[PDB]
């Protein structure tokens, strides 16, 4: 019943009143994302590439997504199911591939799409390729905060809702490393029942909601030099796209 943020994590759902906290142990699938950089001149097509180490075909959808990340700011969605245009989103962004191979095809390249790209699976749990920086050969300011800790330490994060129904909808936080790297760290079903964690922060990091009040949180405890990253909130829409992220708040841990 309760919506999930990944395709495998409706296994676990049980008619039963149960709480789950979930850890998958199935082979990880990896995302080769490439190149790792690359720079055109305005107007040329820019190419990036996934592989995934096992098929992405699952008769209920294809769940590859794309993001675009600037600096300073949360990724945004772009792709979702492999080739799906997100809404209001350029035409000139475009998706395709099946089994293990997709694409994304940006094309004419425009000054405004300097950025960095990732792909992303949301077959099992969720795993993101390393990123292409795509470098080109409206005055904005986009804040956030962040706090340094100990190791061993503690600390909880939050994230609000408003503007649709939060109840219904899976929420995730993913965390971004200093080397760029986005990590999955926690997902929690909507109704509050199934909670998911990758093994790298399990028995750490606590992943909770409440939908009385929409609120989201993260607990994390025994904090290691390892957790530092920027620590994203995010929903779980169509065909498990993450497609609403809220700005990052910064943990540093260090001693």
């Known amino acids: 019943g309760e919506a999930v943020a990944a395709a495998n994590q409706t296994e676990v759902e049980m008619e039963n009143k149960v709480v789950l906290e979930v850890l998958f142990q199935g082979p990880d699938i990896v995302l080769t994302q490439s190149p790792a950089s690359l720079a055109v001149s305005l107007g040329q097509r820019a190419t990036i590439s996934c592989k995934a180490s096992?098929?992405?075909?699952?008769?209920?959808?294809?769940?590859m997504n794309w993001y675009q990340q600037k600096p300073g700011q949360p990724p945004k969605l772009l792709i979702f199911a492999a080739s799906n245009l997100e809404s209001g989103i350029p035409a000139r962004f475009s998706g395709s591939g099946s089994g293990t191979d997709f694409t994304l095809n940006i094309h004419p390249v425009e000054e405004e799409d300097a950025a960095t790209y990732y792909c992303?699976?949301?077959?099992?749990?969720?795993?993101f390729g390393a990123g292409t920086k795509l470098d080109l050969k409206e005055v904005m300011l986009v804040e956030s905060g962040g706090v340094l800790v100990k190791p061993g330490g503690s600390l909880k994060l939050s994230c609000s809702a408003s503007?649709?129904?939060?109840?219904?909808?899976?929420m995730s936080w993913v965390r971004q490393t200093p080397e760029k790297r986005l990590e999955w760290v926690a997902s929690?079903?909507?109704?509050?029942?199934?909670?998911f964690y990758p093994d790298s922060v399990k028995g750490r990091f606590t992943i909770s909601r409440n939908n009385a009040k929409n609120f989201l949180y993260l607990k994390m405890s025994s904090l290691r030099s390892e957790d530092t990253a920027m620590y994203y909130c995010?929903?779980?829409?169509?065909?498990?796209?993450?497609?609403?992220w809220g700005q990052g708040t910064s943990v540093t841990v260090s001693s």
């Open positions: 995010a929903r779980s829409g169509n065909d498990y796209a993450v497609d609403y």
């Open positions: 503007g649709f129904t939060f109840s219904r909808y899976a």
């Open positions: 992303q699976q949301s077959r099992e749990d969720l795993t």
């Open positions: 929690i079903s909507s109704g509050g029942s199934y909670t």
């Open positions: 096992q098929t992405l075909d699952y008769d209920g959808g294809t769940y």
